[PDB]
Nucleic acid binder design. Sequence first.
RNA 1: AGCUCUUGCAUUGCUGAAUUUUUUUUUUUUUUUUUUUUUUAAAAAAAAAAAAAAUUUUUUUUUUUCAAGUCAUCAUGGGGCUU
Length: 100
Amino acid sequence: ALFFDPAATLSSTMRALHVIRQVLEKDGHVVVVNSNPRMRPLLREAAHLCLNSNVWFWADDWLPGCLAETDARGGHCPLLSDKAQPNRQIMAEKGLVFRN
RNA sequence: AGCUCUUGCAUUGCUGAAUUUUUUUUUUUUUUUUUUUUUUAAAAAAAAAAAAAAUUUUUUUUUUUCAAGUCAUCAUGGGGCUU
């Protein structure tokens, strides 16, 4: 067995979501990474239901040296792929982005 | 200038040995999506998927060490020789 905490996890959770909002609307790039296989289809659901162009997702294994960027991959496999943003390909295949 | 004179423990080259076995695991073509360089365009880069596959009658080819051998293969350093 191990620890629990209700107030801290809610506070940290709302805190991290506000952190995601500021880094997103300051024009950065957000990557969501979880390499546990059981929760991968939920991440596919999120990767199909997302709307903003800057949230990115990864579900497979973590390759050795992903963020090393030693050889110029222009960013590694978690970065800019159709796997990273599956929604961007389909949203542009439909052609209509939520655009004004 | 010429040595078939020496020195393979001065050498180049070439080879011996067993070190007898390893020489397929790796790319390329195509697709999709996207982005790097240049005043109407190619490459380039990145994520994924599919196929093509790797020379010759089947052995050659790739291989580490012995001052291993050869100055008579030619060469050539040194020394010797030229009634």
